[PDB]
């Protein structure tokens, strides 16, 4: 099959009208507004009349809550009100009323509610919104528990009774019209008698599995029967209808899965529409995320052209006025209504996903947002689109869904004097819009109809996305919020958004406080740009660029300083299809690898002499080149490395980000005194063959070191292209040599006499072999050769019973199986609290079977091949061993076309204990364990016990659990309520501890400092906190008379950055934190008393404990230590028995250092970051031991939108 011949063909040819929609997707905001202002303009007479009507409605609204009266009656604090409603919610989970009342009277009111009632406070963020109007993303469950005890002990049964009755009313009658469709229908008769109509919302969305989509289907079908029976021939305008969400009806509702959507989702909608046709009721397709808009149009088109649905005008469709495509979508819909002769019911809304759209465009590095960023722009867009709809009432049925009295009044007068039922209507939300619309419906008011959008569902169903619904009308910019704010005048509320926009100095300017994705980092650096795989223009352009990349004769050669070298040449094959030859590699002889190091050494002074700013300029130029070449680079990564387009885009972004980040960090730090190490050997893996390749090399180069680049033998072509780009950007050939080949080439480079440093990403075993070889050598200055190694992980995610299953499953499927699990960060062990384990596991297995595995030149492929047949064999041997032990194994079936490549099906293996898993299994293999809540702390121990410490995830809403878990886990990259993959340079600096590597973190501020002989002070690198054991030690030194060492100890205490705690700039809806902690226990190998004191001061000032070499004979130098210091001090004769250590400090002459370095490399377990100094160096240089390498970096990324919305926005 020809590469990319079927990458992403559209569902249908894009008509002129469809293309005008796509063209507007991310149009600059200043370009969208002027035509909207013009279309929204009305006569001065109309504007005055509309302001009068709006003032009249608002005066009525203000002239006429339950939770607030309850808070007042019992003098509750906010936390008490929230805690009370959480208790009421839990009591309502008890089905029998008499049982519940007995528990309240006999057990709850009397004392400890904790012994009788899953945290009570799982939904406290929602109840917090109800009580306070403010959204907090996580729940302070200890504060709520205290508040609940306090209020119960103060007020007793009466307050509990009142809370229960209040929650019962709100959850049964306010947030929903009824629990079931029959109950909702019964409660609809009252307002139907007043002139209202209804559209029922069954509260389904985001199917994760086929079974869940089928459940949502049968729920919609049963509701259509009930609504149609009740409609009883009233028709689509007077009678009730239904609203559906396409995401409820298929678990893979996305553009990437468009073929499955048209084949599998479309027939389901058609079947529901046929039933709606027979009863003659409305069936409305709700609008969802911006990347689903254009896909949904293909379903609308097919349905409106399907003759089986003819004769029925009930098909409806929502368009969101906050979207830049809205008027063009309306043009398309009106034309479709004309062609089909179906009077499409068009619900105009403003839009419910605003904060999520802002976050998504920022995360994806896209050109602009697909929605407006000023609320007034959405208001003008709405009015302009209403004008378009009101001119087409013969062709469509406009439905103006809004609670904004000003918007309503403007449209009411825009529509003019003539009205008949069926011309158009208004719409509102149940339990929210009735106060406004009771001033609209009826001959005594404005005599215009209103359809009530009526949620229907149980308590569990309505709570799932209640936060997003509350924010529709609850944000500070929301009309319903502002009308209830006394500080907001009626004049402010009736302000005409059209005229306000028209008079702004720059019409349609972007919000001042929302950064475009490119500007996320401000003046520090330019964000890399992504590509929108939902944009048909992008998919069409990418299709051609990808095909063109597959026709190129890609090569990789040994590129020595003197020119390309001869060698053994072989082809490079696509891992997804070995018949697809991607290019040819000429591999490096061991002789030429040694020669390359000599040439690098000869060239080292000339590269070091290029000033740091100019070296950084080379990196910035290379980043521009990679950005411009992204589509071609994507094609090569897809075919050579077996990656999906989505992952290839992110990888090229990461490479660009490394180049720009290290360039900026260089401009912030490097001066004449930060001399280069010399030739650095950069050994890189096949799983991030551009990004990690580029990151290591760029850092070494910009620090002033010439580089020998040894790429993974599986992925030399993208590496050769990366070197070509860096050379084009100005890196001299003598500064950057490419040495393709296998481990023998890597080993020859490591062992070469002039090698001054090694940067390695790959296996622990190979890093250990490199460490053993480097320990044989010292630099010309008699110091160890630095090794930076990142070596993978055994990464866990802990999920408690407060987490949202659908969120968990999505993050798990992505974290475990993205890139076929070939990320070092991939989720390996999912840990499920016992009470939710079976439900989440069922959902996870169902989601597993929705993944498409195959050759990655198709947008529809989710999981590609593993890199080699040997990798495949190793992974499969692990799976079969687990199966042979009787562990439950779930696997997706592989298509026959996978046989030409090396594929492993995504797999779920259920384990009894974490210790059942003994080694990192570098493939799409998720292990699942269950835990009881009281065993959480033991579980964290179990996770730490593997010895790894790279990525870690936690899904919980509860602050106590966040605090506990994050304080006890020992990993470098933590992720809360999100996936654990795709660390962003400079936002989640990436790297771990233990068996996961040495540090410092790539994409972090300590990285460049390891690549120079004297480390600079990184930006923001300081701490006002002083370690108290360090202070006790300095006092002990003064008491012993060691006044010089006591001063040095105090200086180390101040110099240490232990306790640094920063928030890094990044996308909205996330908090990204970076902190410096102690490393652990540092091995001290002193030679003199003063050396031991200096070593102890360095280690204690950075928060560490120590093990001191008993063979030093210096035990008598540490007599009568304070207990606080003694607690941190042990003496070690057998270093291997007393580990693991987290670093080492060595004192001695060159031969002593070499001997100790060899002994240290022989210690089992983690590679130790070793620092050595002579006694004279300790006396001359206060920084003989650099404190940068005695702290541990920790990155934590918290998804603050996880509760369903973004409070900050």
Ligand X SMILES: NC(=O)C1=CN([C@@H]2O[C@H](COP(=O)(O)OP(=O)(O)OC[C@H]3O[C@@H](n4cnc5c(N)ncnc54)[C@H](O)[C@@H]3O)[C@@H](O)[C@H]2O)C=CC1
Ligand Y SMILES: Cc1cc2c(cc1C)N(C[C@H](O)[C@H](O)[C@H](O)COP(=O)(O)OP(=O)(O)OC[C@H]1O[C@@H](n3cnc4c(N)ncnc43)[C@H](O)[C@@H]1O)c1[nH]c(=O)[nH]c(=O)c1N2
Catalytic residue list: 790, 824
52 touching ligand Y, by CB under 6 A: no
Residue 796 β-bridge partners:
829, 952
Considering only residues 685, 711, 854, 982, which one is a binding residue for ligand PRO as defined by CB under 6 A?
982
- For residue 335, which phi and psi values (nearest 5 degrees)? -65, -40
349 touching ligand Y, by CB under 6 A: yes
Q: Is 852 annotated as a binding residue?
A: no
Residue 1148 β-bridge partners:
none
Is 53 or 795 the residue whose CB approaches ligand Y more closely? Answer: 53
- Site mask for ligand X (CB under 6 A), range 714-753, x = bound: ----------------------------xx--xx--x---
902 touching ligand X, by CB under 6 A: no
188 touching ligand Y, by CB under 6 A: no
707 touching ligand X, by CB under 6 A: no
Is 473 or 891 the residue whose CB approaches ligand Y more closely? Answer: 473
Q: Which does 339 bind (CB under 5 to 8 A by kind): ligand X, ligand Y, ligand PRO, none?
A: ligand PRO
373 touching ligand Y, by CB under 6 A: yes
Q: Which does 683 bind (CB under 5 to 8 A by kind): ligand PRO, ligand X, ligand Y, none?
A: ligand X
- State how far the alpha carbon of 731 is from the alpha carbons of 633, 715, 727, 734, in Å: 20, 22, 5, 8
Tell me the C-alpha distance between 101 and 165, whole Å.
Answer: 11
Q: What angle (nearest 5°) sits at the alpha carbon of residue 454, between those of residues 450 and 455? A: 160
Is 653 or 823 the residue whose CB approaches ligand PRO more closely? Answer: 823
**Sheet order of strands, 827-833 included:** 889-891, 907-910, 925-931, 827-833, 795-799, 951-955, 973-976, 1191-1199, 1070-1078, 1061-1064
Cβ-contact 380, 37 below 8 angstroms: yes
Q: Strand 1129-1132 and strand 1105-1109: pairing?
A: parallel
Q: Is 1207 annotated as a binding residue?
A: no
- For residue 508, which phi and psi values (nearest 5 degrees)? 80, 15
Give the three-state DSSP class for 707: strand
Q: Which of residues 1181-1200 bind ligand X (CB under 6 A)?
A: none
Tell me the C-alpha distance between 531 and 649, whole Å.
Answer: 7
Q: Which does 362 bind (CB under 5 to 8 A by kind): ligand X, ligand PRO, ligand Y, none?
A: none
688 touching ligand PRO, by CB under 6 A: yes
CB neighbour list of residue 1100: distance below 8 Å, 6 or more residues apart: 1027, 1029, 1030, 1033, 1049, 1052, 1106, 1125, 1128
1036 touching ligand Y, by CB under 6 A: no
Q: Is 1163 annotated as a binding residue?
A: yes
Considering only residues 104, 561, 699, 983, which one is a binding residue for ligand PRO as defined by CB under 6 A?
983
Q: Which does 291 bind (CB under 5 to 8 A by kind): ligand Y, ligand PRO, ligand X, none?
A: none
Q: Is 354 annotated as a binding residue?
A: yes
Considering only residues 372, 397, 521, 661, which one is a binding residue for ligand Y as defined by CB under 6 A?
372
Name the minimum Å distance from CB 654 to ligand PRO: 7
Considering only residues 575, 635, 716, 762, which one is a binding residue for ligand X as defined by CB under 6 A?
762
920 touching ligand X, by CB under 6 A: yes
Q: Which does 341 bind (CB under 5 to 8 A by kind): ligand Y, ligand X, ligand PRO, none?
A: ligand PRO
Considering only residues 244, 848, 981, 1145, which one is a binding residue for ligand PRO as defined by CB under 6 A?
981
Is 242 or 1030 the residue whose CB approaches ligand Y more closely? Answer: 242
Cβ-contact 1195, 990 below 8 angstroms: yes
Is 45 or 394 the residue whose CB approaches ligand PRO more closely? Answer: 394
766 touching ligand X, by CB under 6 A: yes
Q: Which does 791 bind (CB under 5 to 8 A by kind): ligand X, ligand Y, ligand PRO, none?
A: ligand X
Is 374 or 413 the residue whose CB approaches ligand Y more closely? Answer: 374
Q: Strand 563-564 and strand 736-738: pairing?
A: unpaired
Q: Is 239 annotated as a binding residue?
A: no
3-class secondary structure per residue, 927-987: EEEEECHHHHHHHHHHHHCCCCCCEEEEECCEHHHHHHHHHHCCCCEEEECCCCCCCCCCC
Residue 1130 β-bridge partners:
1107
Q: Is 945 annotated as a binding residue?
A: no
Tell me the C-alpha distance between 528 and 319, whole Å.
Answer: 31
What is the sign, positive or negative, of the torsion defined by CA atoms of 946, 949, 950, 951?
positive
Considering only residues 75, 477, 489, 869, which one is a binding residue for ligand Y as defined by CB under 6 A?
477
Q: Which does 990 bind (CB under 5 to 8 A by kind): ligand Y, ligand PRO, ligand X, none?
A: ligand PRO
Name the minimum Å distance from CB 978 to ligand X: 21
3-class secondary structure per residue, 66-82: HHHHHHHHCCCCHHHHH
CA-based radius of gyration for the chain: 33
Buried b (16+ CB within 10 A) or exposed e, 387-426: bbbbebbebbbbbbbbbbbbbbbbbbbbbeeeeeeebbbb
Quote the strand ranges of 186-302, DSSP E.
Answer: 196-201, 241-244, 283-285
CB neighbour list of residue 468: distance below 8 Å, 6 or more residues apart: 352, 353, 1204, 1205
Q: Which segment (201-209, 587-595, 684-692, 1177-1185) binds ligand X by CB under 6 A? A: 684-692
Is 375 or 883 the residue whose CB approaches ligand Y more closely? Answer: 375
Q: Is 1132 annotated as a binding residue?
A: no
Q: Which of residues 71-110 bind ligand Y (CB under 6 A)?
A: none
Q: Which does 927 bind (CB under 5 to 8 A by kind): ligand X, ligand Y, ligand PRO, none?
A: none
> What's the gap between Cα 1001 and its chain centre?
19
Q: Which segment (310-318, 785-793, 1014-1022, 1063-1071) binds ligand X by CB under 6 A? A: 785-793
Q: Which does 866 bind (CB under 5 to 8 A by kind): ligand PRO, ligand X, ligand Y, none?
A: none
Give the three-state DSSP class for 893: coil
Q: Is 284 annotated as a binding residue?
A: no
Tell me the C-alpha distance between 533 and 515, whole Å.
Answer: 22
Name the minimum Å distance from CB 279 to ligand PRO: 25
Which residue is listed with tokens 């029922």? 200
Q: Which does 22 bind (CB under 5 to 8 A by kind): ligand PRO, ligand Y, ligand X, none?
A: none
Looking at residue 312, the DSSP 8-state letter turns out to be -
350 touching ligand Y, by CB under 6 A: yes
Question: Looking at beta carbons, which residue is closest to ligand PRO?
Answer: 983
Q: Strand 425-429 and strand 396-401: pairing?
A: parallel
Q: Which of residues 787-846 bind ligand X (CB under 6 A)?
A: 790-792, 824
Tell me the C-alpha distance between 572 and 921, whole Å.
Answer: 25
Tell me the C-alpha distance between 983 and 666, whole Å.
Answer: 21
Cβ-contact 353, 326 below 8 angstroms: no
Tell me the C-alpha distance between 680 and 708, whole Å.
Answer: 6
Q: Which of residues 439-458 bind ligand Y (CB under 6 A)?
A: 453
Residue 348: which H helix or E strand, with range? Answer: strand 344-349
Residue 916 β-bridge partners:
none
Annotation: binding site for FAD: 287, 320, 347, 350-352, 354, 373, 375, 402-404, 469, 472, 477, 479
Annotation: binding site: 287, 320, 347, 350-352, 354, 373, 375, 402-404, 469, 472, 477, 479, 684, 686-687, 710, 713, 762-763, 790-791, 920, 1161, 1163
Annotation: binding site for NADH: 684, 686-687, 710, 713, 762-763, 790, 920
Annotation: binding site for NAD(+): 684, 686-687, 710, 713, 762-763, 790-791, 920
Footprint of ligand PRO on this chain (CB under 6 A)? 339, 341, 688, 823-825, 981-983, 990
Footprint of ligand X on this chain (CB under 6 A)? 683-687, 710, 712-713, 742-743, 746-747, 750, 761-763, 766, 769-770, 790-792, 824, 871, 920, 922
Footprint of ligand Y on this chain (CB under 6 A)? 286-287, 318, 320, 322, 349-354, 372-375, 377-378, 401-404, 407, 427-429, 453, 472-473, 477-479, 511
């Amino acid at each position: 099959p020809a590469p990319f011949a079927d990458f992403a063909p559209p569902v249908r040819p894009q008509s002129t009208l469809r293309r005008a929609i796509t063209a507007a997707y991310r149009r600059p905001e200043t370009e969208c507004l002027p035509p909207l202002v013009e279309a929204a303009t009305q006569s001065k007479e109309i504007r005055d009349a509309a302001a009068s009507t709006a003032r009249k409605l608002i005066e009525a609204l203000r002239g006429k809550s339950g939770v607030e009266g309850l808070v007042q009656e019992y003098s509750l604090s906010s936390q008490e009100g929230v805690a009370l409603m959480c208790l009421a919610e839990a009591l309502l989970r008890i089905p029998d009323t008499a049982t519940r009342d007995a528990l309240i009277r006999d057990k709850i009111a009397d004392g400890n509610w904790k012994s009788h009632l899953r945290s009570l406070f799982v939904n406290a963020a929602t109840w917090g919104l109800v009580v306070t109007g403010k959204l907090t993303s996580t729940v302070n469950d200890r504060s709520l528990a205290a508040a609940l005890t306090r209020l119960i002990s103060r007020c007793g049964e009466p307050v509990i009774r009142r809370g229960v009755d209040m929650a019962m009313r709100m959850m049964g009658e306010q947030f929903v019209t009824g629990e079931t469709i029959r109950e909702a229908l019964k409660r609809s008769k009252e307002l139907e008698e007043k002139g209202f109509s209804y559209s029922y919302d069954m509260l389904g969305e985001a199917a994760t599995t086929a079974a869940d989509a089928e459940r949502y289907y049968r729920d919609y079908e049963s509701a259509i029967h009930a609504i149609g029976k009740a409609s009883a021939g009233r028709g689509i305008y007077e009678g009730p209808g239904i609203s559906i969400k396409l995401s409820a009806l298929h678990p893979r509702y996305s553009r990437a899965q468009a073929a499955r959507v048209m084949g599998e989702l479309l027939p389901r909608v058609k079947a529901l529409a046929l039933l709606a046709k027979n009863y003659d009721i409305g069936l409305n397709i709700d609008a969802e995320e911006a990347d689903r808009l254009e896909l949904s149009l293909d379903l609308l088109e097919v349905l409106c052209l399907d003759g089986d649905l003819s004769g029925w005008n009930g098909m409806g469709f929502v368009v969101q006025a906050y979207g830049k495509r809205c008027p063009f979508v309306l043009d398309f819909i009106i034309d479709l209504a004309r062609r089909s002769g179906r009077r499409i019911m068009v619900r105009l809304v403003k839009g419910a996903y605003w904060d999520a759209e802002i976050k998504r465009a920022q995360l994806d590095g896209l050109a602009d947002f697909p929605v407006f960023t000023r609320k007034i722009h959405t208001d003008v867009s709405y009015i302009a689109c209403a004008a378009k709809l009101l001119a087409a009432t013969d062709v469509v049925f406009p439905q103006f869904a809004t609670h904004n009295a000003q918007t309503l009044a403007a449209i009411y007068h825009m529509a003019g004097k003539d009205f008949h039922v069926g011309k158009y209507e208004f719409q509102c939300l149940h339990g929210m819009g009735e106060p406004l619309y009771e001033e609209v419906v009826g001959r005594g008011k404005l005599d215009r109809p209103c359809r009530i959008y009526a949620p229907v569902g149980t308590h569990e169903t309505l709570l799932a996305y209640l936060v997003r619904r509350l924010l529709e009308n609850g944000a500070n910019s929301s009309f319903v919020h502002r009308i209830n704010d006394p500080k907001v005048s009626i004049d402010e509320l009736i302000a005409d958004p059209v005229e306000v926009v028209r008079a702004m100095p720059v019409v349609g300017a972007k919000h001042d406080r929302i950064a475009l994705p490119a500007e996320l980092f401000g003046d520090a650096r330019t964000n890399s740009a992504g590509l929108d795989l939902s944009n048909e223009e992008t998919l069409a352009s990418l299709t051609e660029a990808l095909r063109e990349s597959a026709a190129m004769k890609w090569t990789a050669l040994p590129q020595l300083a003197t020119g390309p070298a001869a060698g053994e040449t072989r082809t490079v094959l696509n891992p997804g299809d070995h018949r697809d030859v991607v290019g040819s590699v000429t591999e490096t002889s061991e002789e030429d690898a040694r020669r390359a190091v000599r040439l690098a050494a000869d060239a080292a002074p000339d590269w070091a002499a290029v000033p740091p700013s100019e070296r950084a300029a080379c990196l910035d130029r290379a980043a521009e080149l990679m950005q411009a070449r992204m589509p071609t680079l994507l094609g090569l990564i897809i075919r050579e490395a077996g990656k999906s387009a989505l992952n290839a885009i992110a990888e090229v972004r990461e490479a660009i980000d490394f180049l720009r980040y290290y360039a900026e960090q260089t401009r912030r730090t490097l001066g004449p005194g930060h001399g280069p190490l010399g030739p650095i050997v950069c050994i890189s893996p096949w799983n991030f063959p551009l990004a990690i390749f580029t990151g290591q090399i760029a850092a070494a180069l910009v620090a002033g070191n010439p580089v020998l680049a040894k790429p993974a033998e599986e992925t030399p072509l993208i590496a050769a292209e990366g070197v070509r780009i860096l050379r084009e950007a100005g890196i001299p050939a003598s500064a950057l040599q490419l040495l393709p080949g296998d481990g023998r080439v890597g080993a020859a480079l490591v062992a070469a006499a002039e090698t001054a440093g090694v940067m390695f990403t790959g296996s622990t075993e190979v890093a250990r072999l490199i460490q053993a070889q480097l320990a044989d050598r010292l630099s010309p200055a008699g110091r160890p050769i630095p090794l930076i190694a990142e070596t993978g992980g055994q990464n866990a995610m802990i999920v408690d019973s407060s987490a949202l299953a659908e969120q968990v499953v999505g993050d798990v499927i992505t974290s475990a199986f993205d890139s076929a699990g070939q990320r070092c960060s991939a989720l390996r062990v999912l840990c499920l609290q016992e009470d939710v384990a079976d439900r989440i596991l069922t959902m996870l297995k169902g989601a597993l079977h929705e993944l498409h595995i195959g050759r990655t030149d198709r947008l529809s492929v989710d999981v590609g091949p593993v890199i080699t047949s040997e990798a495949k064999d190793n992974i499969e041997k692990h799976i079969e061993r687990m199966r042979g032990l009787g562990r439950k194994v779930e696997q997706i079936g592989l298509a026959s076309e996978t046989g030409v490549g090396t594929f492993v099906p995504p797999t779920i293996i259920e384990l009894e204990k974490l210790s059942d898993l003994q080694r990192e299994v570098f493939g799409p293999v998720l292990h699942v364990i269950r835990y009881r809540r009281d065993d959480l702390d033991r579980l964290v121990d179990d996770v730490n016990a593997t010895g790894y410490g790279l990525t870690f995830g936690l899904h919980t809403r509860l602050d106590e659990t966040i605090a506990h878990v994050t304080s006890r886990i020992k990993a470098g990259n933590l992720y809360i309520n999100r996936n654990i993959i795709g660390a962003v340079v400079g936002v989640q600096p990436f790297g771990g501890r233990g068996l996961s590597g040495t540090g410092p973190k790539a994409g972090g501020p300590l990285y460049l400092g390891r690549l120079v002989t004297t480390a600079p002070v990184p930006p923001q690198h300081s701490s006002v906190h002083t370690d108290p054991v360090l202070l006790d030690f300095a006092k002990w030194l003064d008491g012993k008379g060691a006044r010089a060492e006591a001063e040095a100890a105090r200086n180390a205490g101040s110099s240490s950055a232990l306790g640094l705690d920063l928030e890094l700039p990044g996308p909205v809806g996330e908090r990204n934190l970076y902190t410096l902690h102690a490393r652990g226990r540092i091995l001290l190998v002193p030679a003199t008393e003063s050396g031991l004191y200096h070593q102890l001061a360095a280690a204690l000032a950075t928060g560490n404990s120590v093990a001191i070499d008993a063979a030093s004979g210096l035990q008598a130098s540490l007599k009568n230590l304070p207990q606080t210091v003694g607690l941190r001090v042990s003496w070690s004769k057998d270093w291997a028995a007393d580990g693991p250590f987290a670093g080492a400090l060595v004192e001695g002459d060159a031969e002593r250092i070499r001997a100790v370095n060899k002994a240290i490399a022989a210690l089992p377990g983690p590679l130790l970051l070793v620092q050595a100094a002579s006694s004279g160096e300790i006396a001359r240089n206060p920084d003989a031991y650099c404190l940068n390498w005695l702290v541990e970096e920790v990155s934590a990324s918290i998804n603050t939108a996880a509760a369903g919305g973004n409070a900050s926005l």
